[PDB]
């Protein structure tokens, strides 16, 4: 039952330091090695460094010794610190660990890194209700509209997770340092508006938690 | 410092239908005091963590799938899915753990389908947004199949292409479709400066487009 998880900023501006603390759980660190490993937008893998039972460590040659890895084996914390961040630096920065000595079994979900000078901003979050009736016995797709925000990620929910399926959350597209993104779901018209239906948007970034019921709107 | 080099760099397939992925190292991975090739492949699906396949290079790590196969030696490793699921869906990177830690550039598995038409749907401004001076129509094209698709946006009968967004989804883990999202931004005085909006998407699996429109009457 190992587990890892990644806390770190999210956002970094270029030239400034990154802190991430992977918390493990389920092993002490006195026994195993952890690892980072970061995946750039673009996918693939890069190794970063890791540190061993003993403390000793190893890093990346690529990463010019602006990278540094301690840990606190009483609290089961490893802390990542990379310097002077540039833009091809951001990337999903996970913990990782191997129960052998290799290869690694168990990752962290990661933690997103956006490194630029813009400025955190929170999201506004629209419904989205259809313009005219619903059909009898016809399903109906609603949505919600998140515009604005920056840096990444959100994270939408439908009626707190109780709505799972028929959901689709389209990926984020930049314009202009600012994040736009939709999410649709799509249920029975016996169910809406007869029951609520809320999107929970939230950008940990900005501390911003919204809530939009979709309600009919006057045809 | 070993490289790994894969091919294909993406591949698509039926469900059901074998699939072989191949996996180079520059340098062999054969280890002489072990007889053992350091070699692993990981499976990362969309919004999730890499997942160890294989080990040793042909060793499967305990609770995969029986259909997930890997074999090769030295220089040379290949990954075989003998009956590709639905759920496949993934990237498959091979690594190498002898000398430092490397990682090949992926192999992109994609899922061929049947053709699915995409329910269309129309979404006027929010009030909300409104009151902020913005109006973004919205129009949601979902669970179709092939991926191309072509939304064109229509005020008052004439086409507008500025201020249109369009994202798509990653395949349906369960049904392989695509999803689209296209966004038309005005600000709120444009949209008052019109009536008709329509979202008017063609697709393969049809001749006639499909037509979704409302007014701001
Ligand atoms: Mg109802
Ligand atoms: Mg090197
Ligand atoms: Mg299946
Ligand atoms: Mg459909």
């Known amino acids: 039952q190992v587990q890892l998880k990644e806390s770190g900023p999210g956002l970094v501006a270029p030239s400034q330091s990154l802190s991430i603390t992977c918390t493990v759980s389920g092993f002490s660190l006195i026994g195993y090695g952890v690892n980072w490993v970061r995946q750039p937008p673009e996918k693939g893998l890069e190794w970063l460094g890791m540190?061993?039972?003993?403390?000793?460590?190893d890093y990346n040659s690529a990463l010019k010794s602006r990278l540094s890895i301690t840990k606190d084996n009483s609290k089961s914390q490893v802390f990542l610190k990379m310097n002077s961040l540039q833009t091809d630096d951001t990337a999903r920065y996970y913990c990782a660990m191997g129960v052998r000595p290799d290869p690694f079994d168990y990752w962290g979900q990661g933690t997103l890194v956006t490194v630029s000078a813009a400025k955190t901003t929170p999201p506004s979050v629209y419904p989205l209700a259809p313009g005219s009736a619903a059909q009898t016995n016809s399903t109906v797709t609603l949505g919600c509209l998140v515009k604005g925000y920056f840096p990444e990620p959100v994270t939408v929910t439908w009626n707190s997770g109780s709505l799972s399926s028929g959901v689709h959350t389209f990926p984020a597209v930049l314009q202009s340092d600012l994040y736009t993104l939709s999410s649709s779901v799509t249920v029975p018209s016996s169910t809406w508006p007869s029951e609520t239906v809320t999107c929970n948007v939230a950008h940990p970034a900005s501390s911003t938690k919204v809530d939009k019921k979709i309600v009919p709107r006057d045809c | 410092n070993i490289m790994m080099t894969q091919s294909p760099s993406s591949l698509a397939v039926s469900a059901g239908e074998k699939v072989t992925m191949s996996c180079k190292s520059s340098?062999?991975?054969?280890?002489?005091?072990?007889?053992?090739?350091?070699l692993a492949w990981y499976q990362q699906k969309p919004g999730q963590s890499p997942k160890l396949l294989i080990y040793?290079?042909?060793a499967r790590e305990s609770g995969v799938p029986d259909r997930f196969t890997g074999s090769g030696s030295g220089t040379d490793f290949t990954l075989t899915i003998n009956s590709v699921q639905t759920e496949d869906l993934a990237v498959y990177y091979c690594h190498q753990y002898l000398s430092s830690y490397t990682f090949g550039g992926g192999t992109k598995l994609e899922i061929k389908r049947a053709d699915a038409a995409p329910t269309v749907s129309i979404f006027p401004p929010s009030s909300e947004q409104l009151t902020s001076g913005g109006a973004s129509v919205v129009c949601f094209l979902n669970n179709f199949y092939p991926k191309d698709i072509n939304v064109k946006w229509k005020i008052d009968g004439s086409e507008r292409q500025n201020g249109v967004l369009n994202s798509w989804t990653d395949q349906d883990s369960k049904d392989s479709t695509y999803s689209m999202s296209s966004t038309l931004t005005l600000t709120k005085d444009e949209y008052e400066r019109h009536n008709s909006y329509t979202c008017e998407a063609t697709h393969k699996t049809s001749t006639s487009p499909i037509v979704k429109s409302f007014n701001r009457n």
């Open positions: 040793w290079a042909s």
């Open positions: 340098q062999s991975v054969l280890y002489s005091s072990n007889q053992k090739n350091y």
């Open positions: 540190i061993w039972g003993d403390g000793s460590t």
